[PDB]
Amino acid sequence: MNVIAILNHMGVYFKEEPIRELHRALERLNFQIVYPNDRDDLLKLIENNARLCGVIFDWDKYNLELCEEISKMNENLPLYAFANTYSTLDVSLNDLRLQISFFEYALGAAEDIANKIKQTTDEYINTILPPLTKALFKYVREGKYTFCTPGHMGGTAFQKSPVGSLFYDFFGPNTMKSDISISVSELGSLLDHSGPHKEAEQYIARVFNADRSYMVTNGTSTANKIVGMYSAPAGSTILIDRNCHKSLTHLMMMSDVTPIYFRPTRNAYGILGGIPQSEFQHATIAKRVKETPNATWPVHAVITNSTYDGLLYNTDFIKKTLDVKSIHFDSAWVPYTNFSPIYEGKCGMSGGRVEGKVIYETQSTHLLAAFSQASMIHVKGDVNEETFNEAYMMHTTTSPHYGIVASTETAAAMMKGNAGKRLINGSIERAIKFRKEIKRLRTESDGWFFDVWQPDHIDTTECWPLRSDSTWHGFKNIDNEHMYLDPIKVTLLTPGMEKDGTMSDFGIPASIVAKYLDEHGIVVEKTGPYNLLFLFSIGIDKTKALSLLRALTDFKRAFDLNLRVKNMLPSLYREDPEFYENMRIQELAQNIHKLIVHHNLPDLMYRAFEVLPTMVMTPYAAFQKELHGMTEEVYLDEMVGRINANMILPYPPGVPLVMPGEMITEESRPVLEFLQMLCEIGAHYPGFETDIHGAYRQADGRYTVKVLKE
Amino acid sequence: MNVIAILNHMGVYFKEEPIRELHRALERLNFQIVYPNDRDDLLKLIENNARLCGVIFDWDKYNLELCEEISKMNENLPLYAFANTYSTLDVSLNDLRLQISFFEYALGAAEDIANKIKQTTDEYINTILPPLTKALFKYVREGKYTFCTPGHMGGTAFQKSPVGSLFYDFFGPNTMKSDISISVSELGSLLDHSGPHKEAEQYIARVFNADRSYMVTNGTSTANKIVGMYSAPAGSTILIDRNCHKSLTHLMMMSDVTPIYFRPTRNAYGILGGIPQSEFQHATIAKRVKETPNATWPVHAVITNSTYDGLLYNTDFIKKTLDVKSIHFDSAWVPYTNFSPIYEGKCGMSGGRVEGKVIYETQSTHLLAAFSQASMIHVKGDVNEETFNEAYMMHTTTSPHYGIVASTETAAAMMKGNAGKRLINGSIERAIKFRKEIKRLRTESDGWFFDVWQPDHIDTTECWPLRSDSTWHGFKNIDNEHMYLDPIKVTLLTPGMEKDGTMSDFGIPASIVAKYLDEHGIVVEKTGPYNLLFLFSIGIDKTKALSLLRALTDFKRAFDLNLRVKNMLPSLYREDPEFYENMRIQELAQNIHKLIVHHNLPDLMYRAFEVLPTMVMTPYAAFQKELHGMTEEVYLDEMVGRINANMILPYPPGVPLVMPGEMITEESRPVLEFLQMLCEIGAHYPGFETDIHGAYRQADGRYTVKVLKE
Amino acid sequence: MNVIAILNHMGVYFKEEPIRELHRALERLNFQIVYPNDRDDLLKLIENNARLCGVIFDWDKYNLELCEEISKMNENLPLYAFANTYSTLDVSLNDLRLQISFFEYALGAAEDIANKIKQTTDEYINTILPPLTKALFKYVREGKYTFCTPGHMGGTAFQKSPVGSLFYDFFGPNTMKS
């Protein structure tokens, strides 16, 4: 932070010479002076460079031309205004709130003015930096504790070791010294929620519109279990989205609870739809309580809001309708709802308390930018603070990393205020630009191209509603004014399926487009049989957009030339030279596509997940048997009529198929048929193997599963 | 890594000029040349500087004088030997294993020789560096994934933000880029234990003498729960050291188990003694099974080996004697046992398997040097790998930090081989030196001084045995050839108690010595009423030893002058100027000491922990009530006859006093008397407050505790 | 292969200063910068000089005036395009097949951008060179076979002989080692 811009020649020595003296005095005080070519260049420098930290200018020549323009960009930026004859305090200025220091052009003033500017900059720096990190830097500068642990002693031991020097040499002293313990007692305490730790909680709780906010450093995996174990008593029944995370299965195995499942809808594509309004209404729930063996009224519900594909609930309706005392919105996908008005009435925290209920959001901070494992628990309502805090303290890491904690606090510091508001606004604007760019290239090229899966026109900047009277989304009998498409989540479609969900004769499975992009280091966020997703973050610049956009036109060009796999996919070639020697990219695509077409994969996959295996015992009940080691393996073929010991998690489509305690019967035979079909279709091409978790491929090529012993 | 030493003038141009040409050629290839004044300076440079990475010398002038000396220090260090007339392959060399490249002094050779040396150094570097970190650096150099998350995009977002720049500016690009996800698929997988992750496990498992080793990144807190939940079935009885960690209480509350406690011995000082041999013998355990309500034969035992004060068990005796199928040595204090022969027969992993039993060590790597939260599970025996691995995967962080994992791997890299063996040997040697230094200063000074708590003579370098025929240790009727003192753990004694455990008229409580050292930034590892501990690590150098040694003589000097608290403890003074205005350091000491003497604190503390509160219900049973919110607060005075809801953990002495479900009665009245006494003695001086966890100081100054409702 | 052409003054510090920083950063990375007097001089340089291996330009000032003209001469030639306000992905570009990397004018970017350009140039070089000659050069750089024949040992014997040095001195190590 040392670049000072100067903008001018004035035509008079009495002005020019003091600025020369000040230039020189400031350079001696370790400032880099930069000189925008013109007024517009200066505004672009500021706009793009946060390291520009002051502007010197002639008051008369520039004040009415600059002051408001700069204040729009950054209201703390130091301005050093030099006066002429007519320079003064005009009544027009009286009403503006500006951060202004007035200075004259004089030789020999730089020493004192520089010292004041230094002090005033430190004052501004001190205001904007968060206090815990500020104190940490001060310790690293001043403190003198020797004869101390950690044994590495500020990384010292790493430097005398070539092997340790590799790790130290990269990270360096500061990184090594920031790994501190409670021996630095003046930073307060996380466990007492005291000092700069309280200041952080209030800052966050106020920013994110929560009653109370906890900082969790082991992800939403851990936030779920802290909320779960406090929330789900033994012997109780819970309503749980059949679309649930594994960490909630691990909770069920550890707690004696009976699940009744909210039942999402699904369309032919396999895209999950929302739990319909009926699922929340007292009459519907009461009926399932009647139909579920040993069920009682639910004590805790967990809803995933939004769905992945951007269907958000009318949360005003849910909070009013769902008659459950404890409602936990796992809102991992929507951490940003407080920051766009388009999400009002469509998020957990929106509005005020819900009388008679505690509402949770658990959020995976790491659709924002933060270190992996950073998660928040946002509580809207009361807990038993002593029992909740004991629950928190029992599940706290053994050695908390002092950076991870600061990384989550500094992630907010970055996104804070205007400039973070303007950053996200910019990304929304470019999202819509890119959307229209795909349409352009679709026009310009002869023959097949990518398309976008979206409404016919997007004349409106919002999360576009999905309506029952529209066909573009492919869902059947959708609720209206219920689901909305987030502009920044861009799905692309590859050739292979019809707008119906029926199959084309010509197809290019998306997995092949991924292999190509993988040779070129470009990662596809998410891929399905014929779909690819791209996220337009604040990362994504003009260089990356051009490289991606160009890479996509290069795929088409290379595909259409029918390049040899040998030439287009050299790393794949090296896996089996003979297998791949003569194959061309279009033949690889044809063969895999023909398999998909023939094996009717989408229909079989759809049907496997539309019925439920039979719950013979609960996951917890089966785990009691496992706890005593009462498990054997059987072959996959032999599994009908047996009680499964493990979750069986196949890829595709990546969601649980059989739970511990469930059994395939005749009612649920399509389950087994899908599984056997996956083993067959995936046995053909090296690099395109079957993948089913919970099934064990024996060295002989047969699959086993774990079952309960009799 | 670029410093090359040259050692010589030879008196002939045909030798000197090529070395000039090579000096210049090497400087142009970015080597720093250094010139030891003499042969001894070179050996000291090598000994102290790992960045010296090559030595050029005249073969004849130096080979018989240098080769073996350097090979003793570092057997990979590149040597570049220049030949004369008599230089050749003498039969005497045939048997030595050396890393030698032979070169001639010639102009113009540096370009090619430098390139070979560069390549040969990279080959050596590549051998010594561990492969996962090596691959990570290569990615950071070569890879080109754009349009990607993490959103911060290699820290890019931090740089445009003064607040984020504070965090980035300190850590920098490399630190920011090493926070990666499984998108970098070529590093293998932790969860599959595959690729460079397997290579790490084998490396560690072989180094630490285990059958199998797991890498845990959430401390031994988490290692305990992974082993616990696999090991302790519901309805079973467990033998557990009444000296247990809180994380094992949190396990008991979560699992339906019945505890029977191994009962340590204790002496008047309050120092824990070992569970006697009788506690392991079948007849003793059988008798407690009879006497314990609803007890069955134990399925799992947890012993803390060693004790803190260095009493190690004959583990050969325990493994042979203790008739329990599952024995878990929580060996957090003894991570280094594999590396000194003095610990043979005295650690969990020593020797081979124990037929018919699984033996665990859980170790807190962070008495070594590693990041906080680093812990290992070392298994000696078989587990059900699928159920154990499912247990591991359920308790794995949400977002693993990729550095923490490398920090534990690089901590081993540092300590590896000879140089890490010589480092620890050096620390043992200095420990004994310092021990004799305290004795010297004790002689030189008139009047009182510090003493060391150790045997009368230490003519032997080992862990000295504590014997029943010796009085120095203060324990009553100790087992012989049972406990040993680790030389590197140095306890110092302050005036105040007699060698009996009886009280002196003159005392200086250790807490006051801590306040002094705290003003000077010096931390005391561990303090008790009249004791202070110092660890002589590989960190501790001559500068730190002198500063500590001098700081200790300065305390005496300043104490004996009776400086004003105002002058000697200015920060304490600022807390209450009026309170402290006229008080001198000796008066502060007197008043606090007189309190200790009068309140007979050691006797009362000793007695509070020698009886056990009555277990009315188990901690788990009480938690069922808490699970339903059935808790109220009562005042401390009102607690006899009530069932405690929380653990009550007082400081001092820092170990549990009452468990959930326990009740103070008449049998255990000294418990309440100690607690009330602590509230009284600690109410006198600002900065010397009472501290009891589980008791809540109300704003009015009264204490409450949580109890079960009736 | 190290001559990079720069074609411009733009009249604004926010553009000119990053290009100054990049000029200097690139010169430190061992590039020779050349400056065509004008657009036509640049096209003649390219047309006549295969050692010109990259062009840096302002996207708006020059893209519609240069892109097609350069693509007619050499379709692998690295272009480093710097963006302004109106710079973006216009539907008109969607159909052209071009080798384009997009970059911004920024101080301190040269170290990373230079490394990417170096890598991208090596990728282009590696595509165009035939693989046997490529492998031969790699051996001459890395391999370490000593105690070997040919007896001349990479021409070594020629250098100690004035008569043999006449033949070696002219051809040199590379010719002798191939």
Author numbering:
A (entry chain A), B (entry chain A): 1 to 366, 368 to 711
C (entry chain A): 1 to 178
Q: What does the literature reporting this entry say, word for word?
A:
extracellular pH, and works in conjunction with a cognate inner membrane antiporter. excreted by the antiporter in exchange for a new amino acid substrate. that it is a decamer made of two pentameric rings. central pore, with the CTDs at the periphery.
